[PDB]
Amino acid sequence: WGKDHQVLRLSMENAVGTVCHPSLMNIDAAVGGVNHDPVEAANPYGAYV
């Protein structure tokens, strides 16, 4: 109920401004920011072609 006791609704077509913007595909800050302090061998089985 919004202000005024009006019963309201959101749903998920409502998230199109957030997740349908090309911020979803931008991770370069993440992949570089987790890169530092290198990590051990990961048993590159499913990790290697």
């Binding site: 401004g17 349908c20 913007h21 090309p22 911020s23 595909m25």
Partner: protein, 49 residues
Amino acid sequence: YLGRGAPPLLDNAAAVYLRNAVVAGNRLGPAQPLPVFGCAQVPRRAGMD
């Protein structure tokens, strides 16, 4: 799409296709493009309750 902090989609058709699919009628949606220097200019509506 009211700000710019996002490197866009690399297909320029994809970018403009999705921008104005989202931005089409949004209550926040930019009135005129996001000026390079300027305010994002949320449209003002004839009335509010």
